[PDB]
Write an enzyme that holds these catalytic residues in place. Structure first.
Site, PDB file in Angstrom:
ATOM      1  N   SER A 196       0.838  -1.222   0.000  1.00 30.67           N
ATOM      2  CA  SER A 196       0.000   0.000   0.000  1.00 30.67           C
ATOM      3  C   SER A 196       0.872   1.272   0.000  1.00 30.67           C
ATOM      4  O   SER A 196       1.700   1.419  -0.871  1.00 30.67           O
ATOM      5  CB  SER A 196      -0.983  -0.076   1.156  1.00 30.67           C
ATOM      6  OG  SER A 196      -2.142   0.660   0.890  1.00 30.67           O
ATOM      7  N   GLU A 323      -9.262  -5.419  -4.052  1.00 31.88           N
ATOM      8  CA  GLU A 323      -8.585  -4.263  -3.429  1.00 31.88           C
ATOM      9  C   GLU A 323      -9.558  -3.247  -2.803  1.00 31.88           C
ATOM     10  O   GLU A 323      -9.338  -2.722  -1.697  1.00 31.88           O
ATOM     11  CB  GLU A 323      -7.714  -3.558  -4.518  1.00 31.88           C
ATOM     12  CG  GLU A 323      -6.410  -4.326  -4.979  1.00 31.88           C
ATOM     13  CD  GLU A 323      -5.351  -4.462  -3.855  1.00 31.88           C
ATOM     14  OE1 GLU A 323      -5.625  -4.003  -2.730  1.00 31.88           O
ATOM     15  OE2 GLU A 323      -4.254  -5.047  -4.064  1.00 31.88           O
ATOM     16  N   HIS A 436      -7.877  -6.029   0.167  1.00 32.31           N
ATOM     17  CA  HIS A 436      -6.647  -5.204   0.436  1.00 32.31           C
ATOM     18  C   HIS A 436      -5.948  -5.590   1.725  1.00 32.31           C
ATOM     19  O   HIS A 436      -6.576  -5.517   2.795  1.00 32.31           O
ATOM     20  CB  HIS A 436      -7.052  -3.723   0.550  1.00 32.31           C
ATOM     21  CG  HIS A 436      -5.891  -2.778   0.689  1.00 32.31           C
ATOM     22  ND1 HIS A 436      -5.019  -2.513  -0.344  1.00 32.31           N
ATOM     23  CD2 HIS A 436      -5.486  -2.003   1.734  1.00 32.31           C
ATOM     24  CE1 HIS A 436      -4.137  -1.609   0.052  1.00 32.31           C
ATOM     25  NE2 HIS A 436      -4.393  -1.290   1.310  1.00 32.31           N
TER      26      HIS A 436
HETATM   27  F   LIG Z   1      -1.567   2.201   2.799  1.00 31.26           F
END
Ligand SMILES: [F-]
Ligand SMILES: *[C@@H]1O[C@H](CO[C@H]2O[C@@H](C)[C@@H](O)[C@@H](O)[C@@H]2O)[C@@H](O[C@@H]2O[C@H](CO)[C@@H](O)[C@H](O)[C@H]2NC(C)=O)[C@H](O)[C@H]1NC(C)=O
Ligand SMILES: *[C@@H]1O[C@H](CO[C@H]2O[C@@H](C)[C@@H](O)[C@@H](O)[C@@H]2O)[C@@H](O[C@@H]2O[C@H](CO)[C@@H](O)[C@H](O)[C@H]2NC(C)=O)[C@H](O)[C@H]1NC(C)=O
Ligand SMILES: *[C@@H]1O[C@H](CO[C@H]2O[C@@H](C)[C@@H](O)[C@@H](O)[C@@H]2O)[C@@H](O[C@@H]2O[C@H](CO)[C@@H](O)[C@H](O)[C@H]2NC(C)=O)[C@H](O)[C@H]1NC(C)=O
Ligand SMILES: *[C@@H]1O[C@H](CO[C@H]2O[C@@H](C)[C@@H](O)[C@@H](O)[C@@H]2O)[C@@H](O[C@@H]2O[C@H](CO)[C@@H](O)[C@H](O)[C@H]2NC(C)=O)[C@H](O)[C@H]1NC(C)=O
Ligand SMILES: *[C@@H]1O[C@H](CO[C@H]2O[C@@H](C)[C@@H](O)[C@@H](O)[C@@H]2O)[C@@H](O)[C@H](O)[C@H]1NC(C)=O
Ligand SMILES: *[C@@H]1O[C@H](CO[C@H]2O[C@@H](C)[C@@H](O)[C@@H](O)[C@@H]2O)[C@@H](O)[C@H](O)[C@H]1NC(C)=O
Ligand SMILES: *[C@@H]1O[C@H](CO)[C@@H](O)[C@H](O)[C@H]1NC(C)=O
Ligand SMILES: *[C@@H]1O[C@H](CO)[C@@H](O)[C@H](O)[C@H]1NC(C)=O
Ligand SMILES: *[C@@H]1O[C@H](CO)[C@@H](O)[C@H](O)[C@H]1NC(C)=O
Ligand SMILES: *[C@@H]1O[C@H](CO)[C@@H](O)[C@H](O)[C@H]1NC(C)=O
Ligand SMILES: *[C@H]1O[C@H](CO)[C@@H](O)[C@H](O)[C@H]1NC(C)=O
Ligand SMILES: *[C@H]1O[C@H](CO)[C@@H](O)[C@H](O)[C@H]1NC(C)=O
Ligand SMILES: [Cl-]
Ligand SMILES: [Cl-]
Ligand SMILES: [Cl-]
Ligand SMILES: [Cl-]
Ligand SMILES: [Cl-]
Ligand SMILES: [Cl-]
Ligand SMILES: [Cl-]
Ligand SMILES: [Cl-]
Ligand SMILES: [Cl-]
Ligand SMILES: [Cl-]
Ligand SMILES: [Cl-]
Ligand SMILES: [K+]
Ligand SMILES: [K+]
Ligand SMILES: [K+]
Lengths: 527, 176, 352
Positions: A196, A323, A436
């Site tokens: 990320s 995601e 995610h």
């Molecule tokens: F992040």
């Protein structure tokens, strides 16, 4: 008893038993002067020598940060909240080395995510003892400043120049160059990896000249600096530094006067006010993040990307099948972690209003047009699926694919993966899919622990990913060479081959999300 | 295996079990049920179809290969049987185009699309659906061996169907 | 040699390693060892390479053997340094006497104690280093003998003898496989007999005698040498491959044994250049030619004999896989040595 001499003095570690073997852990070694008092908002300063045995036997303070209080008592969200005291005194790192102590081991440096507003190296899903045990690599991770304390900017002015958290990361990589040979590591073989915002960070060290000589290769999990959330314009950044001043009754304007007021304030007031510096945030807001400081980052990064100005080396880049889902429950209407979230047309449109705050009417209609041409039945989850895909395609998947092409067009080998396995231990409900952040436990090898609830087939997927990650770090090539594995083809624009990661059959596929990314990448930036 | 490979030497039969029972992995109680179906289907249908397609196309003609993967919602056979031998046919002749008839909307659309591609192949030698932004059907070449998947969800271009299984049927098995 | 050879008139910048069998496997591991990269220029491997099934000991087998040796010498302890120290009191004979028994079943090809993945000389499993291009970049010259396997058949295969023609039966062939492939599953052993006993054809009473030699030679020497050569050359270096097919006229072993393991060596070191010494004229000429090509390879990276209208040695590329034959009569350029046999050893056998 097991002591290593660094440039700044002696540090003691601790033995750990792992899968019938031993790993040595040095937890919480300082790497910079505590950034307190007159040093708040400045670049990290180098550390004064200690005579002393510094005891690296416990994780150290996490940096100051706001905490996710949206689902108290829920492991799904709380596994990401910090697990050591918060404190501005947080510039520390960890080293896991194998036993017996290696001769000239490859180094893996983990940079955590958190939207640049949150995160910490001490989370259980970032524990490097498994990688050290299983692959005999050395694993290093560091805490770096986040939120205003890490990214407040008043450009050109060194009291608050921007990008302090990125310099934190840099100064740590420096520590590995100067000190890792003492631990048995190879300063000439260092791979950065992160997820990320951690991944966006890795991508910016590929662009920062000061970082060129502090690593060999790079791995980007769900993130790259061209994601729409990752870089703050110079304009937004001053507006935010100035809004923060207003909110803390620190409006002045011998601009150094502002910073000095802000240094009298204490961390809570700063943290409390961060949320309101933007008029409309989203679940994806990065209030304070990387900027073009003219130091770490010399020009707008899209331009550097496009014109080939970055370290030449191999990259390994990837994303998860779902995601976007994780963000839908922090404010999209009709979404809940505790039901199936079937939403209406009308709920989808308001959902776009939450994620695309302003964003013109036509821009928002464009998105609904691209993503709601149904094939077909209705199919009551249609609109629930579209919104997840919108958020995931725009924020993660398309910027990752565009990074990968542009990089590889300058002649380096690139490898792209599409992670599609849902953890059997995921505490989030099923409609959320392969969320995610949920590849990470696989990359660090937690399913290799038999005591721990994962399926056999999950053990095998983790063992395989761990091997490919390590082969990439040591040799620039993410193959599993022994167990008749699917061969990972390089990514070229033209073919755009990627590998799928799942428990059943791993596949070579081409042009991930082709039709969706044409929309995000060629049409959307216009509106 | 004794039923399907009547004589067939002992070693031939062990070969099959070796090729097809190296488990990935858990056990996975249906492992052996799945292997036998695959053995019968790979030997009898899929590998000879793929070998025909390469040999033919090597003499310079265009060839198109599909992997049909949709289970009829009206299949009267149970679920472990999957996308059975013979159950593409109702799709090719367009029975799901009949609304009165129980098939899903998404099945209607798959049939309409297959019917179009079949017909374009007959009229023009090229099985494309040109109007509804469809996945373009690449020709089969040995070397690449691209094929198209047919299903209600997302149709895909894939390569080298059953590669590891057919090496076994096509290069090793005829020897025993 | 790096520190001292210039004093003797030598060039530390021009050193070629060469060796045979385990010596060759050793050369191949110096190609992989980072500490050796700067201590030589080029390399020659005669009948050996480290991917041969006898050449590297797993970390598992290795401790089991060090521990069995401890048991056998009444040196079982377990402050493991305690074990080693006991072993240093023992004298060489006790250690040597016990070595044979550290494995439950050996073969005539057993390497009880050999190279391991130490994390020092060898940083990872060598197949992986090979496959991923992690080795010194330079020219190699690699070769094998026509009858690599025969020499081993008389150290325990039943019905074999150096003092008769060794015509063996089907049944003797199967037990022979039991001796060479100790465990090795039943199916693995049937696979070998299937691959190697499809006769063309007559019977041909030596059929089974020939098959066993070929099995041993193909598995242990020839296929691992050919697989090494492809993988190496795929990373862009020139490679030259030879198939040595001349039987020494002085070989003391009988004729059915053919061009045995180890019997190129006297040719490479030039013993037939000695006229006093019994070799034929044509053997003198073959040795003079091999000596020249070896030396041209060392000095210039290219094993040609440039003056006597010789057959030009083509480089090995996977794809073509051209190799040169060495014999007294006509030397030839040929392609894909043992193609059908190595597909079996290299793609199918490691599975069983
Ligand atoms: F992040
Ligand atoms: C650039 O700056 C102004 C700052 O406005 C903000 O004042 C902060 C202290 C904070 O409390 C915040 O909530 C407030 O909005 C922004 O102008 C604002 O824009 C909104 C939305 O259109 C108006 O309705 C506000 O009333 C207006 N406020 C004021 C005081 O003028 C501006 O949009 C901003 N841009 C950024 C940060 O990207
Ligand atoms: C799934 O739940 C959502 C989320 O909000 C709700 O959490 C539920 C578990 C439920 O018990 C409820 O009390 C709580 O508010 C539901 O969205 C809500 O829908 C209500 C009426 O049902 C609206 O009036 C609300 O504005 C909206 N609330 C919020 C906070 O956004 C959702 O309807 C439900 N969906 C299902 C069961 O499919
Ligand atoms: C790993 O270790 C044991 C060791 O067994 C051996 O003990 C040595 C001292 C030696 O004398 C040797 O002959 C003896 O076998 C191995 O287990 C053995 O396996 C065989 C064959 O299946 C059995 O019949 C033996 O009785 C058994 N012995 C004991 C004491 O348990 C094991 O197979 C070995 N593996 C290796 C070295 O690769
Ligand atoms: C070739 O010789 C072998 C090897 O063993 C023998 O050496 C011979 C020269 C012979 O004089 C004999 O006394 C000695 O044992 C023969 O194999 C043997 O065959 C015998 C009977 O002939 C069997 O009963 C034995 O088990 C086997 N012996 C061993 C030690 O393995 C072989 O038969 C012979 N072959 C010929 C002449 O073609
Ligand atoms: C440790 O290895 C050093 C170089 O090895 C590396 O070479 C780099 C260019 C890169 O390819 C890495 O991935 C390689 O592993 C060498 O110069 C040092 O001398 C070595 N140090 C020791 C053995 O102490
Ligand atoms: C001896 O020659 C040295 C270099 O010659 C070699 O160059 C190497 C790269 C390799 O190609 C070899 O096979 C070459 O022969 C030279 O630098 C020394 O100065 C020379 N020393 C003397 C003449 O005393
Ligand atoms: C560091 O840890 C060890 C505990 O094993 C202790 O003996 C040592 O003196 C400690 N130093 C401190 C607490 O300052
Ligand atoms: C491959 O082989 C075995 C499973 O049979 C496993 O135990 C081993 O660790 C595997 N290695 C990798 C890299 O997956
Ligand atoms: C494509 O378009 C419409 C669906 O919107 C459909 O009714 C028509 O028959 C389709 N044609 C083909 C060939 O699939
Ligand atoms: C080639 O020529 C003559 C034989 O006529 C021989 O004496 C000489 O040594 C030969 N050289 C080589 C390298 O074979
Ligand atoms: C305003 O104040 C500072 C004193 O801190 C002074 O040097 C200067 O005149 C002004 N600031 C800057 C940044 O030049
Ligand atoms: C067992 O004995 C040694 C003494 O030789 C001691 O230092 C240690 O505690 C143990 N061995 C090892 C290898 O650590
Ligand atoms: Cl354990
Ligand atoms: Cl998907
Ligand atoms: Cl509408
Ligand atoms: Cl696989
Ligand atoms: Cl394609
Ligand atoms: Cl389609
Ligand atoms: Cl492919
Ligand atoms: Cl031959
Ligand atoms: Cl039989
Ligand atoms: Cl010649
Ligand atoms: Cl040919
Ligand atoms: K797709
Ligand atoms: K397949
Ligand atoms: K041959």
């Amino acid at each position: 008893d097991i002591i290593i001499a660094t440039k700044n003095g002696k540090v003691r570690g601790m033995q750990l038993t792992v899968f019938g073997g031993t790993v040595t852990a040095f937890l919480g070694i300082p790497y910079a002067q505590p950034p307190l008092g007159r040093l708040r908002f400045k670049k990290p300063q180098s550390l004064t020598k200690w005579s002393d045995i510094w005891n690296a036997t416990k994780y150290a303070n996490s940096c100051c940060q706001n905490i996710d209080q949206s689902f108290p008592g829920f492991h799904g969200s709380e596994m990401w909240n910090p697990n050591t005291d918060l404190s501005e005194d947080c510039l520390y790192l960890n080293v896991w080395i194998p036993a017996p102590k290696p001769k000239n081991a490859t180094v893996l440096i983990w940079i955590y995510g958190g939207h640049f507003q949150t995160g910490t190296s001490s989370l259980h899903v970032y524990d490097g003892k498994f990688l050290a045990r299983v692959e005999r690599v050395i694993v290093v991770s560091m805490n770096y400043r986040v939120g205003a304390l890490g990214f407040l900017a008043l450009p050109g002015n060194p009291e608050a120049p921007g990008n302090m958290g990125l310099f934190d990361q840099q100064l740590a990589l420096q520590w590995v160059q100067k000190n890792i040979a003492a631990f048995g590591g190879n300063p000439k073989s260092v791979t950065l990896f992160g997820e990320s915002a951690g991944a966006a960070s890795v991508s910016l060290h590929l662009l920062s000249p000061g970082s060129h000589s502090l690593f060999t290769r790079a791995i980007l999990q769900s993130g790259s600096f061209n994601a729409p959330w990752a870089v703050t314009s110079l304009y937004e950044a001053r507006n935010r530094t100035l809004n923060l001043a207003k909110l803390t009754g620190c409006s002045r304007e011998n601009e150094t006067e502002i910073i000095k007021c802000l240094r009298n304030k204490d961390p809570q007031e700063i943290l409390l006010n961060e949320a309101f510096v933007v008029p409309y945030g989203t679940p994806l807001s990065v209030n304070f993040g990387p900027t073009v400081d003219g130091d770490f980052l010399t020009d707008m990064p899209d331009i550097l990307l496009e014109l080939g100005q970055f370290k030449k080396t191999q990259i390994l880049v990837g994303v998860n099948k779902d995601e976007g889902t994780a963000f839908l429950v922090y404010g999209a209407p009709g979404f809940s972690k505790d039901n199936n979230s079937i939403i209406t047309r009308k709920e989808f449109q308001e959902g776009l209003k939450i994620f695309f705050p302003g964003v013109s009417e036509f821009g928002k209609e464009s998105i609904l047009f691209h993503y709601t041409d149904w094939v077909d039945d209705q199919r009551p989850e249609n609109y629930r699926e579209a919104l997840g895909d919108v958020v995931g395609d725009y924020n993660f998947i398309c910027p990752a694919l565009e990074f990968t092409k542009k990089f590889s067009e300058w002649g380096n080998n690139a490898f792209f993966y599409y992670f599609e396995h849902r953890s059997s231990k995921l505490p989030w409900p099923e409609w959320m899919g392969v969320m995610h952040g949920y590849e990470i436990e696989f990359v660090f090898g937690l399913p290799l622990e038999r005591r721990d609830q994962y399926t056999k087939a999950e053990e095998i997927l983790s063992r395989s990913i761990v091997k490919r990650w390590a082969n990439f770090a040591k040799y620039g090539n993410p193959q599993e060479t022994q167990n008749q594995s699917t061969s990972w083809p390089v990514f070229k624009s033209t073919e755009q081959k990627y590998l799928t990661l799942n428990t059943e059959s791993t596949r070579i596929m081409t042009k991930l999300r082709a039709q969706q990314c044409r929309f995000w990448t060629s049409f959307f930036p216009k509106v």
